[PDB]
Amino acid sequence: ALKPLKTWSHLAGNRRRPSEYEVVSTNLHYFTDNPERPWELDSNLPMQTWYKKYCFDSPLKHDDWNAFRDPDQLVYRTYNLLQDGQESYVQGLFDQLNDRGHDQMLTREWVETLARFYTPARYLFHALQMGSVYIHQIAPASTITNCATYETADHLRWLTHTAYRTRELANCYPDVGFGKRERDVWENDPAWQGFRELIEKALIAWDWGEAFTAINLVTKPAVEEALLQQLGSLAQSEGDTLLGLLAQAQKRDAERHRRWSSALVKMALEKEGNREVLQKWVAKWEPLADKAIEAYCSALPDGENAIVEAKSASRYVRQMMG
Amino acid sequence: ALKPLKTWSHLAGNRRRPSEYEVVSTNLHYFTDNPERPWELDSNLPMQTWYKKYCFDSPLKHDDWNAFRDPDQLVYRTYNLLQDGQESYVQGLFDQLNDRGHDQMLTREWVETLARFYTPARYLFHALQMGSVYIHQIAPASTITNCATYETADHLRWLTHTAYRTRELANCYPDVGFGKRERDVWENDPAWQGFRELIEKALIAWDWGEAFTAINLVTKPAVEEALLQQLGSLAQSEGDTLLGLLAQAQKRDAERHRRWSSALVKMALEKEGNREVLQKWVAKWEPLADKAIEAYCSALPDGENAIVEAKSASRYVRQMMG
Amino acid sequence: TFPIMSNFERDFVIQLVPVDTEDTMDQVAEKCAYHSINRRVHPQPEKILRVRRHEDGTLFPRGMIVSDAGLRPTETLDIIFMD
Amino acid sequence: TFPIMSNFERDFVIQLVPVDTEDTMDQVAEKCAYHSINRRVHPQPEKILRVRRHEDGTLFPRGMIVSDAGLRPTETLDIIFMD
Amino acid sequence: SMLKREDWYDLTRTTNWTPKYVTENELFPEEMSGARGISMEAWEKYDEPYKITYPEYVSIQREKDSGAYSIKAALERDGFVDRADPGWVSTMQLHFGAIALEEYAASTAEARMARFAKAPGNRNMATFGMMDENRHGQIQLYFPYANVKRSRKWDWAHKAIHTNEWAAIAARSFFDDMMMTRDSVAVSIMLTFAFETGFSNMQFLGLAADAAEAGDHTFASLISSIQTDESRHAQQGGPSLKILVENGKKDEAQQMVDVAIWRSWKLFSVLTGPEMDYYTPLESRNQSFKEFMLEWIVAQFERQLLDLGLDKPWYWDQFMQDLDETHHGMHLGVWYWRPTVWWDPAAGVSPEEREWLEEKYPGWNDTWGQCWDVITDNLVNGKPELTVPETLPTICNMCNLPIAHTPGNKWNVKDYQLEYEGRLYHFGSEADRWCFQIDPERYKNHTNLVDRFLKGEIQPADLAGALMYMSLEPGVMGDDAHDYEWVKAYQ
Amino acid sequence: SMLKREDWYDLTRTTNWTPKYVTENELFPEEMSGARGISMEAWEKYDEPYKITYPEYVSIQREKDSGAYSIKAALERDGFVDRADPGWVSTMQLHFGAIALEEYAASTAEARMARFAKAPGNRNMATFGMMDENRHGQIQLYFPYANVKRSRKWDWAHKAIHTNEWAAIAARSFFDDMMMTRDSVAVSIMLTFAFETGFSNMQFLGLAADAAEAGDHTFASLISSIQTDESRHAQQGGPSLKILVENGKKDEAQQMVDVAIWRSWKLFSVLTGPEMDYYTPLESRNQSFKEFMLEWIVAQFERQLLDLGLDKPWYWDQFMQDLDETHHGMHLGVWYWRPTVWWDPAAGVSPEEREWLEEKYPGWNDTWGQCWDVITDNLVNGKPELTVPETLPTICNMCNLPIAHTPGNKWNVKDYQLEYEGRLYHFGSEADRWCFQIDPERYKNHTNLVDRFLKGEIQPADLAGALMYMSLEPGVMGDDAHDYEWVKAYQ
Ligand SMILES: [Fe+3]
Ligand SMILES: [Fe+3]
Ligand SMILES: [Fe+3]
Ligand SMILES: [Fe+3]
Ligand SMILES: [O-]
Ligand SMILES: [O-]
Ligand SMILES: [O-]
Ligand SMILES: [O-]
């Protein structure tokens, strides 16, 4: 008879007793057991073909993708511990800054800036959500998927903040069109077309590795520097303390997405040729990001400096991974 | 044989099935069972004499003090639910405003205001804590005691915020004396002597009813309007967004103390002669409060207006109870 | 050597039974019974084991051999009690 | 009528036993035994129930009466087996 | 102050836009979205009845885990598992192995909707769905992991769905068809409406009662907690179906429901059926598998389908009859072939059990009873070797379950055979075959375990060989749950 | 970023100042502070070893309640209480009645320190202490409240300490002396050092093991959780004692420890002793009351007292001997007078029990065994009426417990009598009397139940009268726990 083990069989050679994270997150996808027939059906089904093309045939390659480890070690249980604290903080701000009539103290000019540059953030944030939720479903290993899982929820977190603040702004300034106008702005405002083009295109990059790259390494850096870093400094300087705070709060999430993305890249660089594969994808996408940041920030106050600082801050994210 | 009941025997005539609050909070003090001998020892012990004098012989009178009900219905379990959310919000602010170098952006003048008018808040807040903790131990009914219980913890909450911010301020401005100087300011600064005198005196009012009055109806209103309302508007207007926020956060507690205090008074007014007993205690103490607010706010910027607004806001608390 | 699917009378399940192309129906019936009689079905020694094609109810003579029956590999066969 | 505290030989506990000032030690001993013999102590019918003051070990004559013994109300009395 | 949810909720799902830099079909490829000719604007009528927002979710679900994890730590050192009825322990080992990794896979099925549904309401709900199955998968691993030192069987909580053991293949066959390999709208119908709302909601409810009845409070709390998450994502198919009916697509909707319900039922007949009627001890049995099915699953479907504007599936009356039969089949097969599974099946044919079985299913002793008579006589008479197999059963090509049915004095076992492109397929039921005929390209070149045996893919090509191919060894290979204790009653 | 606790902690307790508008003695009256001639500045050396701040407290303690309340809701409908061993149910009914309202009263004892201690460290720790006993009181009411419909006995969870039932008076006698009627520093020594650190910490630990051993996981979790709160406020007396020793006051400190330990021990001998050695069924008994006392309570005191610069109390060797005796007394008294209590005492003198008792306490059968022989013969011979009393026992004037000790072949029952100001007092032990002689003004005119009976305060002046005065009626009046089941073993 086979003897009972100390831990799961797939983890039995380890030396350190496995963590809760290792126990509940590792080696869970089963469609990678049979590369020739991922799913327990006919091998010519469209979805069979999709996974073979966009997951197995990716030029980003590793012998053991299951070895990946979220450096933050998130599980569902500790995801909700963390984000519940963070949400008590942000809903704290909403509750208390309202009580105090914060939206009433903003200038007419700044209110006009919010309709054009902020509210209209619900489409881009929902599009990141769709973006990360695609990485989840095509990534080659459950630990990679999970990072995308929790990231997808953060992106919905941001969309949710924005939708909430949008209604508060519509309550306080009914004649501005908050909540009614955002689609036309996203669709037609020059300031947004740079981003819209970047995200629409990235959203049809099906290769798991190119998806990771376009969404996590290229687009998000650009979106985070433009919308969180740059609009938030501007907010703080213009009397909007809520948004200055809200944005720094969401940037905690963005930071954590970067830590896992950087870990992934670190792991990819273990294998000859992956840096070049990654650099080639970056080179294809970076120009779209440039356009995106240019069109958005150039229309901000102090437009040119915000372009320079965002450009170099988002390139810095990738520089630091190699 | 006596049959099992639906609820506790002391609650059996009620119509509405009792709440968790009623179940865990009512009719718990036993020293009121034997007014002639509160404690299970010799009846001439100093503590026997103390409770007969300061609890039973109080001129504030009711036949059934156990009938009192916290309008907020706090139990320990729901106290910590509430204050944990509130603390995730306030520690949120501390964490994030630091990350952002908030203390570095304050002016030298405002920093000097904080050493004199704010930090020095740890003594007054600890003295309220001692104040409410005395009400707990001499009040005639467990439901009255409990309100004092949770209030005593809030007062320690405020002392704790202040001690924390005091160290942060000492880190950022080492040559100001933050943390070393507060005792001498509290002890010798004209701005504080008004308060110091009010609280030192109120702290030796042993009668439970006079304690309630001096601490909850008179002193706290004065302390809350001066230190939270007035210093916090000033803070917000001077660039200190942390303290503007911290103070509005602590005023949520102060609001809740007022709701129970007002409930108590409502209950006392059911019995002929109690209004006059209460008014006489207010009249004895109100002048000390006046002095306190005068000495503190007069030294603030825009000193005279802050005196007028605080004076009338704290009188308004008592006006609204009758 | 040739796979068939045995649906044995009074059993609960169809089973895979390898037979030989050179077997008689009688000998198919014996190869099937081994997996049914005295595991899940009671012997009926006053009776004779017959073979019929499951799909259409055609009865095979005791003596006809597999090679001549025109079975599809894996074809399903009833194994019935008769006289 | 007069309270005493009965510490009965071989029992585990002292007990309150009302007696009469007019009782004999013998009759004190009987009033005590009622609360001990056949509840918690075994009879000893080859033996005699004697009364002694707990505090100092003084033995009372079977026949001396309570009124003459100079007891304090509630005084504690040993109830011992003798011959 | 805070807003009321009602006032801003709609803004969370006002996320559709008209693409410009890429086309709609490129952004929403049909094979993933299945929008089915119905416009973006018509997909926008989609209105989920149970609403929730991010802060509510993270808050409530933190509470749920607090509780469940705490009940687990509290009861851990008492070791209920070392003294539980072995029919129960076996119910748990079966549950975890079949379910834990399919739960986790369900978050990918949810991700499918989250990216590819045209209904913004669906994309956000599916995002919470995604988080929910992440939770179900993870917690259904953390729990059995407590027991890894007690037996290698508990390792199958993780390993099972990685193996070619036959039950795992039946599981994957179901799950991949329902939720991993279909367009977003089909996932919404086939998984969330038909399987989750139709079966697993009520199942988990009964499964929790049963754990409690066994005095297993860790597992009762686990299952009970998971169940509270179901309806928040289970609701998703309903609004889809409304949209398809209201536009030109009732037949397509109907046909997808038809398929999903049959396939779920077949899985359910081997995973729940046997455990209800045979692993649970007698004095714990509240109602029969058939009773449970009628009261808690079948009236509900009729109710749902009437409200949606749909029909009862063509096979409904047959489905009704089979509640007397199929699961007795599945239990007999599982116990007879018990070394091929990773739990110890409980025979459950003690005299008291058989009268119970006869009350609940008139005719049982004169049909099902016959095979067990023979099994029993053999064990009484020291011939245990005639109670384990020497061949494979015939597997259905759709459900990947053995083809079994009524034996004994009312023998009625049938093969619903089909010849298609030079290959012969075997089906367990008329509905199983029809699932294949409506969509043969989706099943054609799949091979069941038997096909694989026959083609030379299992080597050595014998029973020991098939055990190794299924990753089974002694230590996990199943045997009789009460170690043949019930045989004593017959001597 | 956040600071590290170490960096700012001291500022939380830098709260002393020099009063001006009122005097120090007015602000800190000696009868409440007990500063004892030792200066404000010397009280400032007070340094609690276990540190905590408000945000940590509210956070951790929210988690604790989450868990405990959740385990309670999870197990509620299984009704373990309706099938628990009745010796166990009785242990619970005793525990709640004696403890719930004294816990709550302890928050006032904590408030005493919070207002009146001169050590700022003490005032803040006592504030958390205050919150902790609020929690203990409340949760020890919410829990038994679950059972109010099962029996009127559960109402005593609330009612007991409101009555003059004799056990309640013994409880109040203890608690009021230790913690309700002393100066702040004395409370810190007498309650937190001597009682909480000395006894209830280890007790609650054993009490939790025992619940688990009984298969009561609600109560095990309850008790276990309360226990995790103890040390945060229990620590308070230690630093006090250091300060008194280091200044001119070792004797005063010594004498307060001496008193607190004896009084705690006496209560413990009736509340824990009997339940350990007689209510817990045989096969659950890990160690004896005496063993537990030596390993978990007595070595600890010696350890503590050596580190503080203190001596073992004058009565130590006697205390040692009495571990063989006192609690057998208290159990016999409680069972014999069982209608005077609100739980059903378990006799626990079955033959197997008596050999256990003889292993654990050599001489038992030839001392304690004698009384039970007689009780037993009477029950065997249909004379149950000789197994209930017709008088009151003599009560000790200090501990308010009956004066009992070794019977049988080694009879050794003594009264430590004292005549003082024309009144005769009775004491259960030499240490009990000495507690009165060092401080007679604090006990003089108190009357025990017997004194009250004798003075005419209980009317009618008979046993039924004394039952009504103690608020006892049928339905709560105690009887034999297993309804005399154990008598069958003797016939
Ligand atoms: Fe699930
Ligand atoms: Fe689900
Ligand atoms: Fe406590
Ligand atoms: Fe305590
Ligand atoms: O699921
Ligand atoms: O689910
Ligand atoms: O306590
Ligand atoms: O405690």
Asked if F212 lies within 8 A of E66 by C-beta distance, the reply is no
Is residue F237 within 8 Å of F126, Cβ to Cβ?
A: no
At C59, is the secondary structure helix, strand, or coil? Answer: strand
State how far the Cα of E82 lies from the Cα of F165, in Å rounded to an integer: 45
Going by the DSSP 8-state scheme, the letter that residue B173 receives in this structure is -
CA closest to E100 among chain A residues: A28
Count of positions (residues) in chain D: 83
Asked if B249 lies within 8 A of A96 by C-beta distance, the reply is yes
State the resolution, in angstroms.
2.5
What would the DSSP string read from start to end of A222-261? HHIIIIIIIHHHHHHHTT-HHHHHHHHHHHHHHHHHHHHH
- Tell me if F355 is assigned to a ligand binding site: no
State both tokens at B185: 């300011």
Residue minimizing CA distance to atom 1 of ligand 5:
E103
* Domain encompassing residue C55: 1-83
State how far the Cα of A245 lies from the Cα of A251, in Å rounded to an integer: 10
The type of residue at F154 is W
Q: Which residues of E touch C13 (CB under 8 A)?
A: 329, 332-333, 393-394, 402-404, 413
- Is B136's Cβ below 8 Å from some Cβ in F? yes
Which segments of chain B are extended strands (E)? none
Q: How far is the CA of A147 from the centre of ligand 2 (A)?
A: 20
**CATH label of the domain that carries residue C19:** 3.10.20.270
> Cα dist. E374→A65, E349, E368, E377, E482 in Å?
52, 12, 11, 5, 19
Which residue's entry shows tokens 């299992």? E458
At E459, is the secondary structure helix, strand, or coil? Answer: coil
Number of domains in chain C: 1
Instruction: From E203, E356, E365, select the one nearest E282 (Cα to Cα).
Output: E356
Is residue C9 within 8 Å of C79, Cβ to Cβ?
A: yes
Asked if F475 lies within 8 A of B83 by C-beta distance, the reply is no
Q: Which residues of E touch F75 (CB under 8 A)?
A: 217
Number of other residues whose CB lies within 10 A of the CB of residue B197? 17
State how far the Cα of F89 lies from the Cα of E379, in Å rounded to an integer: 46
Whether residue F229 has its Cβ less than 6 Å from ligand 8: yes
Is residue A154 within 8 Å of A128, Cβ to Cβ?
A: no
- From the list F391, F408, F415, the residue facing D7 with the nearest CB is F415
Is residue E389 within 8 Å of E410, Cβ to Cβ?
A: no
To test the contact with chain D by mutation, choose from F330, F381, F403, F427 the residue with the greatest count of D C-beta atoms within 10 A, namely F403
Instruction: From B13, B135, B19, B131, select the one nearest B74 (Cα to Cα).
Output: B19
To test the contact with chain D by mutation, choose from F391, F401, F427 the residue with the greatest count of D C-beta atoms within 10 A, namely F391
User: Distance from first CA to last CA of chain F, Å, rounded?
Assistant: 76
Asked if B187 lies within 8 A of F20 by C-beta distance, the reply is yes
Q: How far is the CA of E172 from the centre of ligand 6 (A)?
A: 17
Contacting subunits of C (3+ beta carbon pairs below 8 A): E
State how far the Cα of B39 lies from the Cα of B33, in Å rounded to an integer: 9
- From the list F11, F134, F137, the residue facing B179 with the nearest CB is F11
- From the list B80, B166, B204, the residue facing F65 with the nearest CB is B80
State both tokens at F193: 């050092």
Number of other residues whose CB lies within 10 A of the CB of residue B189? 18
State how far the Cα of F78 lies from the Cα of F72, in Å rounded to an integer: 11
Q: How was this structure determined?
A: X-ray
Asked if A88 lies within 8 A of B88 by C-beta distance, the reply is yes
Is residue C23 within 8 Å of C65, Cβ to Cβ?
A: yes
Is residue E31 within 8 Å of A204, Cβ to Cβ?
A: no
Residue minimizing CA distance to atom 1 of ligand 7:
F103
State how far the Cα of E478 lies from the Cα of E345, in Å rounded to an integer: 7
Number of domains in chain A: 1
State both tokens at A113: 């800036």
Phi, psi (degrees; rounded to nearest 5) at D18? -70, 135
Which residue's entry shows tokens 């379950």? E401
Residue minimizing CA distance to atom 1 of ligand 6:
E230
Size of interface B-F (CB pairs under 8 A): 228
Long-range contacts of E455-463 (CB under 8 A, 24+ apart): E463/E389, E463/E390
Is residue B203 within 8 Å of B127, Cβ to Cβ?
A: yes
Distance of CA F424 to the CA centre of its chain: 27
- Is A142's Cβ below 8 Å from some Cβ in E? yes
At B264, is the secondary structure helix, strand, or coil? Answer: helix
Instruction: From F258, F289, F255, F285, select the one nearest F271 (Cα to Cα).
Output: F289
- From the list E26, E27, E115, the residue facing A133 with the nearest CB is E115
State how far the Cα of E148 lies from the Cα of A18, in Å rounded to an integer: 13
User: Across-strand partners of C20?
Assistant: none
> Cα dist. D12→B30, D2, E163, F407 in Å?
33, 23, 73, 5
Chains F and B touch (3+ CB pairs under 8 A): yes
> Cα dist. E446→A40, E169, E173, E443, E449 in Å?
7, 11, 10, 6, 10
Is residue B156 within 8 Å of B140, Cβ to Cβ?
A: no
Asked if B201 lies within 8 A of F154 by C-beta distance, the reply is no
State how far the Cα of F170 lies from the Cα of E197, in Å rounded to an integer: 60
Q: How far is the CA of F204 from the centre of ligand 7 (A)?
A: 10
To test the contact with chain E by mutation, choose from C10, C12, C16, C36 the residue with the greatest count of E C-beta atoms within 10 A, namely C12
Q: How far is the CA of B81 from the centre of ligand 4 (A)?
A: 22
Q: How far is the CA of E419 from the centre of ligand 2 (A)?
A: 37
Residue minimizing CA distance to atom 1 of ligand 8:
F230
Q: Which residues of E79-97 are buried (b: 16+ CB within 10 A; e: fewer)?
A: ebbeebbbbbbbbbbbbbb
Strands F418-420 and D2-8 come out as unpaired
Long-range contacts of F386-391 (CB under 8 A, 24+ apart): F386/D38, F386/D39, F387/D39, F387/F336, F388/F336, F388/F337, F388/F338, F388/F339, F389/D35, F389/D39, F389/F336, F389/F337, F389/F463, F390/D34, F390/D35, F390/F463, F391/D15, F391/D16, F391/D17, F391/D35
Distance from CA of B320 to the nearest CA of F (A): 30
Secondary structure of F393-449 as H, E, C letters: ECECCCCCCECECCCHHHCCCCCCCEEECCEEECCCCHHHHHHHHCCHHHCCCCCCH
Whether residue E230 has its Cβ less than 6 Å from ligand 6: yes
Q: How far is the CA of F101 from the centre of ligand 4 (A)?
A: 12
Count of positions (residues) in chain C: 83
Which segments of E91-187 are extended strands (E)? none
Instruction: From F191, F223, F188, select the one nearest F206 (Cα to Cα).
Output: F223
State both tokens at E182: 């279909």
Burial of F168 per CB tally in 10 Å (0-12, 13-18, 19+) = buried
Cis peptide bond prior to F460, omega within 30° of 0: yes
Q: Alpha-carbon Rg of chain B, whole angstroms?
A: 22
Cis peptide bond prior to B59, omega within 30° of 0: no
What protein residues have CB closer than 5 angstroms to ion ligand 4? F 196
State how far the Cα of B36 lies from the Cα of B39, in Å rounded to an integer: 9
- Write the residues followed by a gap in chain A (C–N more than 2.5 A): none
Burial of A65 per CB tally in 10 Å (0-12, 13-18, 19+) = buried
- Is B14's Cβ below 8 Å from some Cβ in A? no
Longest dimension (CA), chain A: 78
Tell me if the domain spanning F1-491 has CATH number 1.10.150.120: no
Is residue B251 within 8 Å of B180, Cβ to Cβ?
A: no
Strands C2-8 and C76-82 come out as parallel
Distance of CA E171 to the CA centre of its chain: 7
